């Protein structure tokens, strides 16, 4: 708030990963400005996620005390005790982004979400007997990686695109060719500017094995067609962590908001400086605390995502409605 210039959020309940995700989205400047320009004039008071998300971001940018999220949770109706224990973190990122993306249709910033988090991949099926291949284009906003028996992110990506053999009792129904031996896999067509990677650490029991991830991650090796104009080099932006015996822990997140390597810890309402080692290597696991989700930004688009945002980037109409609500509380 004063020691770092950043204000955290107060844990109003058992929200688990929620507070960690909000700070990550808030420091996605390119995404932040898009939400400020959302037409939320005649939206419901406390029944609109886009509006309720706008308020949080504004209070985060201006307020000097810990920010609250009570109104936000009720926005999407997760007020039950076990609400968060029955949902993955990416499920909330998808729930949040889908609501704002729909509310942004037809404006100047429509489609901003796919521009930042949307990527293209291809799932296929190839058989060695005949010559029938079936490809399927798909879109992805978050990537679920496996970490059991995986040393680092490199091996995890290798297993993600690894080919699977459909033979023996798992032969592929080649349609007119009957059961056939084939192999199935997936390939990465493109990588979005902002990369969200969830680590499969909750396979009903938390696993605390050691998993390594670098500050700079080159992903050109996993693309179908490389582009010398823009390499697939990504920079670590945020690290969400958790420590606990299978059912409860302190949810902390590490961030370098400007992408300059100056990291900070966000224990809800307590924001403080920290070393890059405490944010990266100290969260590999092996202690007993380990990260469960990573955020990477394309090196070429780092300045675009983290562009500077001032108080002039918020419409005057929204500022009054937000100030009028805060003032009305007085
Ligand atoms: C208490 C929870 C925190 C929490 O409630 N959650 C749900 C779990 C997470 O989404 C990570 N995760 C874990 N396992 C997966 C398995 C498959 Cl198959 C696909 C996706 C995932 C995945 O995303 C994080 C958010 C936790 C358990 C274990 C380790 C760390 C945290
Ligand atoms: Zn996400
Ligand atoms: Zn704390």
Q: How far is the CA of 90 from the centre of ligand 2 (A)?
A: 5
The beta strands (E) that lie in 256-298 are given as: 263-267, 270-274, 290-298
CA dist 224 → 132, 161, 189, 217, 219 (Å): 20, 11, 6, 17, 11
Tokens representing residue 218 in the block: 């080159």
Looking at the DSSP bridge assignments, the partners of residue 241 are 252, 291
User: Could you tell me the distance, in angstroms and rounded to a whole number, from the CA of residue 122 to the centre of ligand 2?
Assistant: 20
- Pairwise CA distance, residues 138 & 126, whole Å: 17
218: alpha, beta or left, given left = phi > 0 and alpha = psi -120 to 50? beta
The verdict on the CB of residue 242 being under 6 Å from ligand 1 is yes
Which residues are in the CB-under-5-Å shell of ion ligand 3?
A: 267
DSSP classification of residue 249 = E
* Secondary structure (DSSP) of 135-199: EEEEEES-EEEE-TT--BHHHHHHHHS--EEE-GGG-EE-GGG-EE-EEEEEEES---SEEEEEE
CA distance 292 to 253: 10
CA of 88 to the centre of ligand 1 (A): 6
Closest-CA residue, ligand 1 atom 26, reads: 202
Distance (Å, whole) CA 49 – CA 108: 20
94 backbone dihedrals φ, ψ, rounded to 5° = -70, -40
Count CB neighbours of 169 within 10 A.
6
Residues sharing a CB contact under 8 Å with residue 244, sequence separation 6 or more, in sequence order: 206, 250
Is the distance from the beta carbon of residue 200 to the nearest atom of ligand 1 less than 6 Å? yes
CA distance 17 to 81: 14
Q: How was it solved? A: X-ray
Which domains, and CATH codes, for the chain?
A: 8-118+300-330 (no CATH), 119-140+161-191 (2.20.210.10), 141-160+192-299 (no CATH)
């Amino acid at each position: 708030k004063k020691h770092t210039g950043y204000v955290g959020l107060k844990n109003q309940g058992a929200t688990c990963y929620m507070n960690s995700l909000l700070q990550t989205l808030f420091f996605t400047n390119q995404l932040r400005k898009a939400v400020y320009m959302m037409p939320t004039e005649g939206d419901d008071s406390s029944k609109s996620v886009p509006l309720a998300l706008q308020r949080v971001f504004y209070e985060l940018q201006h307020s000097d005390k810990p920010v609250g999220t009570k109104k936000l949770t009720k926005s999407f109706g997760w007020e039950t005790l076990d609400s968060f224990m029955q949902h993955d973190v990416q499920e909330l990122c998808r729930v949040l982004l889908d609501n704002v993306e729909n509310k942004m249709k037809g404006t100047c910033v429509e489609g901003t979400i796919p521009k930042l988090f949307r990527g293209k991949m291809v799932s296929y099926i190839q058989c060695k007997e005949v010559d029938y291949r079936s490809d399927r284009r798909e879109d992805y906003y978050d990537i679920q990686l496996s970490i059991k028996g995986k040393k680092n992110i490199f091996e995890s990506f290798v297993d993600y695109v690894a080919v699977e053999q459909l033979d023996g009792d798992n032969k592929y129904d080649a349609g007119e060719h009957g059961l056939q031996e084939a192999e199935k896999g997936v390939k990465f067509l493109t990588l979005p500017p902002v990369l969200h990677l969830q680590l499969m650490r909750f396979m009903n029991i938390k696993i605390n094995d050691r998993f390594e991830f670098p500050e700079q991650l080159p992903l050109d090796e996993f693309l179908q067609k490389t582009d010398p104009k823009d390499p697939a080099n990504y920079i670590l932006h945020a690290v969400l962590v958790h420590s606990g015996d299978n059912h409860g822990g302190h949810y902390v997140v590490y961030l370098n908001p400007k992408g300059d390597g100056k990291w900070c810890k966000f224990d809800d309402d307590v924001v403080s400086r920290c070393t890059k080692e405490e944010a990266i290597e100290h969260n590999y696991g092996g202690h007993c605390t380990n990260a469960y989700m990573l955020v990477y930004i394309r090196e070429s688009k780092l300045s675009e995502v983290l562009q500077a945002v001032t108080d002039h980037d918020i419409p005057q109409q929204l500022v009054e409605r937000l100030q009028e609500e805060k003032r009305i509380e007085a």
